[PDB]
Amino acid sequence: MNNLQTKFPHIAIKLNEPLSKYTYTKTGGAADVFVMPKTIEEAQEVVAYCHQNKIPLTILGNGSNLIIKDGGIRGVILHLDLLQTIERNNTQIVAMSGAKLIDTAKFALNESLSGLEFACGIPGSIGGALHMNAGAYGGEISDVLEAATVLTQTGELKKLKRSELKYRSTIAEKNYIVLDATFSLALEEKNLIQAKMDELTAAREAKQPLEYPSCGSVFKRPPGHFAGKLIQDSGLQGHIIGGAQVSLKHAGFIVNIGGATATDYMNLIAYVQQTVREKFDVELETEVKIIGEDK
Ligand SMILES: Cc1cc2nc3c(=O)[nH]c(=O)nc-3n(C[C@H](O)[C@H](O)[C@H](O)COP(=O)(O)OP(=O)(O)OC[C@H]3O[C@@H](n4cnc5c(N)ncnc54)[C@H](O)[C@@H]3O)c2cc1C
């Protein structure tokens, strides 16, 4: 409980670590117990330990899709940053859950493998990707997810196949901790994949603030409306609270113009939600995950 580091020396662990250092928005209060496993077995022992002692456990990828309140988070947060491997395996790609999705789409191209193009620009880890059935440009992880190695809440490995894997995953429910993923790709010319990747980078760059830290598109798309358009239409574009701003480039993004805090994010998110429902009677529901409690 407080006793974890005792049982497992040799497992890189940290005390009361402020998470903003590891999050894509550069925000979030501290997490009381922060663990980074070098090994799969290490991940197992910790998951099992927390389960058995009923200690709430959270898995943090790169927080490119979450906001962590300044009250921080209770229990143990596991970050699988050290599980980084990416491998070639005939027409198939195997990547560990701590690998960056962008690197996995870079690899694919070096091998003349097609099917990942859609992810050359999606930030975050492979673990987050499977958890979110990450997708962009009509493409999606489920389109090419072959197999995954996972940890059940009790700590056991479970090797999954297509059948057992099923809009931004059966991984989400069933609360599996992804350890590595296998994508079924197809052989195709470098040039053709290149033209898609350039097309996609061009497209995304033209429309997204990639320069600023942010989570992604903050809201799910309301039936027959664009999040961004509503926001923009409600006069909220450019709005600032503390160090947070409804992006002047894409109104559905809240960028960090410097020193933003999770409080700032939650506050801007709520004010947008509130203003939008007053002008158009539409419920903007967050896409981005919200975790920790109120400081
Ligand atoms: C500029 C920008 C653009 C973006 N564009 C897109 C886009 O085009 N398409 C898109 O789909 N998303 C997009 N996102 C959101 C984000 O990139 C994806 O949701 C991403 O896959 C999340 O990765 P992560 O590792 O950051 O997850 P985190 O934000 O760290 O957490 C995400 C969720 O996954 C869970 N999780 C994380 N790792 C694991 C693991 N190993 N096992 C199990 N669960 C895990 C977390 O507990 C949490 O529920 C964008 C974000 C930004 C900031």
**Sequence ranges of the chain with CATH classification 3.30.43.10:** 1-84
What does CATH list as the number for 209-295? Answer: 3.90.78.10
CB 112 within 8 A of CB 193: yes
Assess whether the C-beta atom of 124 lies below 6 angstroms from ligand 1.
Answer: yes
Q: Is 109 helix (H, G, I), strand (E, B) or coil?
A: helix
Strands (E), 53-154: 57-60, 66-68, 73-79, 86-89, 92-96, 113-114, 135-136, 139-140, 145-151
Q: Count CB neighbours of 88 within 10 A.
A: 13
Q: Count CB neighbours of 158 within 10 A.
A: 14
C-alpha span between 20 and 276 (Å, rounded) = 29
CA 177–ligand 1 middle distance (angstroms): 14
Give the ligand 1 atom nearest the CA of 123: 17
Residues contacting residue 93 through CB under 8 Å, at least 6 positions apart: 86, 87, 104, 107, 108, 111, 113, 116, 182, 183, 185
The amino acid present at 15, given as its one-letter code, is: L
Tokens standing for 3? 């006793």
**Sequence ranges of the chain with CATH classification 3.30.465.10:** 85-208
Query: Is 74 a catalytic site residue?
Result: no
**Sequence ranges of the chain with CATH classification 3.90.78.10:** 209-295
Residues contacting residue 124 through CB under 8 Å, at least 6 positions apart: 24, 61, 62, 64, 65, 100, 101, 134
C-alpha distances (whole Å) from 201 to each of 102, 118, 139, 196, 259 are 11, 10, 14, 9, 28
The amino acid present at 283, given as its one-letter code, is: E
CATH class held by domain 85-208: alpha beta
Structural resolution in Å: 2.7
What string of DSSP letters covers 30-73?
A: EEEEEEE-SSHHHHHHHHHHHHHTT--EEEES--TTEEE-TT-E
Query: Is 163 a catalytic site residue?
Result: no
Q: Please give the method by which this entry was determined.
A: X-ray
Q: With CA atoms as reference, report the closest residue to 83 among 121, 44, 54, 48.
A: 44
CA 128–ligand 1 middle distance (angstroms): 4
- Element holding 91 (H helix, E strand): none
Answer CATH for 1-84 from 3.30.43.10, 3.40.50.720, 3.90.1150.10, 3.40.50.1820: 3.30.43.10
Assess whether the C-beta atom of 125 lies below 6 angstroms from ligand 1.
Answer: yes
CA 64–ligand 1 middle distance (angstroms): 5
What are residue 211's phi and psi, to 5 degrees? Answer: -65, -35
Query: Is 217 a catalytic site residue?
Result: yes
Burial label, 97 (beta-carbon count in 10 A; 0-12, 13-18, 19+): buried
